[PDB]
Design a protein around this ligand. Structure first.
Ligand SMILES: CC#C[C@H]1NC(N)=Nc2cc3[nH]c(NC)nc3cc21
Ligand SMILES: CC#C[C@H]1NC(N)=Nc2cc3[nH]c(NC)nc3cc21
Ligand SMILES: [Zn+2]
Ligand SMILES: [Zn+2]
Lengths: 369, 369
């Protein structure tokens, strides 16, 4: 048998850490990047291709799947893993952020809202969110939080989220199958305010979670501000548990966040911007639709080990994306997700060899040249 | 070394034949179905996936590739095979039909036309079409024909096409690299008129080609009429060369056309209707968007050996197509192309075992139940 959840730090450099999370469905190498699979698919990739790029875990969403195709329906069909054909760990967001981003009525009990898809009306609460995530069969369950710049007011939302974090913990612990086979993460709130971040961290650590996410970022704050908040926020979290930065981000954001103690990441940038023609390279991103690539026989990136860069030219991918061909989206997406995973591998290896500081400097010098 | 073009008939049953075409880039099992790759991609499939389904040869188009990305450009980038990553045979249509279907001025010299894409003006002729197909590096080159129901008038178009067939032959034979490494097929015209089909067949056989296509069908004539035309048209063609029915078709069309002596087929139905939610099965086509499939855990087809049917349920593919997800198009397309190839395999095996008559009866009884 394998453990439910065991995080082990193998090496450190400054605030950066590298290690593993062992879970029943597999091992997660940290720092980790999670491709986003909101609609029970990582867009334009088979799950075998997601795995081939190096991903150990993907992200799903309570909000989208409760609406389409439905949580109880996925459970009847055998759970999210069987449904989409990914047999490794899945982390699910709780719905707190997506309900706010995508027609809502807030209270201490929870949120009622109108779906952006049907106009149908629905409810979420800590207890319903945890139940939905159980029905999906998520391996890492997120606590349900209230999400809203803010006064002052940020403290009201943070304090409610901490009350909801306790209800999430209790709902999770009441479901034996969940508590024995899954892990539960809390979400730190408090916006840009050091004192509220501390109050939030204290509340979560008093409750106790398997891991701690940093919420309230990647919402348009600029990298300077995000780094400032991480500087004081991450040290407040339990050192011996994973630290998950929700929604981040660009390669340069990921590197700086690892320098500040983050272990886990998710964002739509590699998939969405790949479909839109943006390819990541070690010399910075390029827009493959640009006419300069029409006769370029080189691969998207000259060092990348992915299957796309072993077989097809920039010129061919340029043609596909210009033509609106599905294979264009497929190849751009595979390459970008592989690039993100190779970035994470380089981060892990450099921390384990005690040269991550030098890697970060070298990476930024070339990427921004 | 391998032969330029060697067709060998291994078994016959009635007018049906099964065998092989050996070419420098591989062997083509007949009767053969060619997936369509008009824009230098079989839509939503990597070439390795096209091959995995059983395809021996794919179809490309002079008309689309001369416009985007351009014939001379593809040649500079190393040819169509290298460009799209398919290293097996490619048959290219000559442009005669697509120029008519997709703003044109006809003459004995050729056709000038306005592109449906740019509005730019272009010319095609027998000599330019053959040159374009040389630049692409096509393995089976189609003669350039004039295409237009018709009086009477059908005879005018047919006779010009026969003059253009001779010019196509001469242009091909003037290009040593082409004549040594590629094959050339002629196109029989004459519409529904037995006497014109005979005049056309005579003209083509006097010129001499590696294979003979039956043109002027799959243009909305109904299956009864198509079969009537094949009944008298295919016997007019040289028995010892392949017979190619352009643009056909539905599974039931393919079976009946093999019964009448056709060896080669192409159509967009499995790819295009797959993206639109139609899946082929041995019990007939189904529309996977229908609500009856929302909780159906069976595969698309209960006997199909394709990778899609080994891993994912109807319910999951239903969800993907309803959501507009790219993976939906990918999986539907792989399954439909695999189904077509399994149909062709069953046809070949039954002819080689002398039970094709029984297969056709059994196939129709189940498919149309
Ligand atoms: C306050 C707060 C907060 C966090 N709460 C929940 N439940 N999910 C998140 C997802 C995020 N995605 C992005 N940017 C794309 N920032 C996020 C923040 C959260
Ligand atoms: C008269 C005539 C004729 C043939 N001539 C050339 N060059 N290409 C063809 C392609 C076809 N596609 C379909 N149906 C989709 N019928 C076709 C017929 C032709
Ligand atoms: Zn790559
Ligand atoms: Zn199948």
């Amino acid at each position: 048998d394998r453990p439910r959840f065991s995080f082990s730090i193998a090496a450190r450099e400054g605030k950066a850490r590298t290690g593993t999370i062992e879970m029943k469905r597999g091992v997660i190498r940290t720092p980790a990047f999670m491709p986003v699979g909101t609609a029970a698919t990582v867009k334009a990739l088979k799950p075998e291709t997601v795995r081939a790029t190096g991903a150990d875990i993907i992200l799903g969403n309570t909000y989208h799947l409760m609406l389409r195709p439905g949580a109880e329906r996925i459970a009847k069909l055998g759970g999210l893993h069987s449904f989409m054909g990914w047999d490794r760990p899945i982390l699910t967001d709780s719905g707190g952020y997506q309900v706010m981003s995508l027609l809502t009525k807030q209270s201490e009990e929870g949120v009622t809202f109108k779906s952006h898809l049907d106009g149908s009306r629905h409810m979420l609460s800590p207890e319903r969110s945890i139940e939905i995530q159980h029905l999906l069969g998520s391996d890492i369950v997120m606590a349900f939080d209230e999400c809203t710049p803010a006064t002052s007011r940020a403290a009201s939302s943070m304090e409610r989220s901490m009350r909801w974090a306790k209800r999430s913990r209790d709902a999770f612990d009441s479901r034996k199958e969940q508590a024995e086979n899954a892990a539960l993460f809390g979400i730190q709130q408090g916006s840009v305010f050091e004192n509220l971040r501390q109050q939030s961290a204290d509340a979560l650590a008093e409750i106790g979670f398997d891991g701690y996410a940093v919420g309230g970022l990647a919402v348009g704050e600029g990298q300077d501000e995000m780094f400032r908040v991480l500087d004081f926020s991450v040290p407040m979290l339990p050192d011996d548990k994973p630290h998950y930065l929700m929604g981040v981000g660009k390669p340069d954001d990921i590197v700086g966040a690892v320098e500040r103690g983050i272990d886990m990441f998710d964002c739509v940038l590699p998939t969405r911007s790949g479909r839109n023609g943006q390819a990541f390279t070690w010399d910075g991103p390029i827009n493959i639709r640009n006419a300069r690539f029409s006769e370029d026989l080189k691969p998207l990136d000259s060092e990348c080990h992915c299957a796309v860069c072993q077989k097809w030219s920039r010129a061919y991918i340029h043609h596909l994306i210009r033509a609106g061909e599905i294979l264009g989206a497929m190849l751009m997406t595979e390459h970008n997700i592989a690039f993100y995973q190779q970035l994470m591998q380089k981060i892990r290896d450099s921390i384990s060899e005690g040269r991550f500081s030098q890697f970060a400097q070298d990476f930024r010098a070339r990427y921004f040249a």
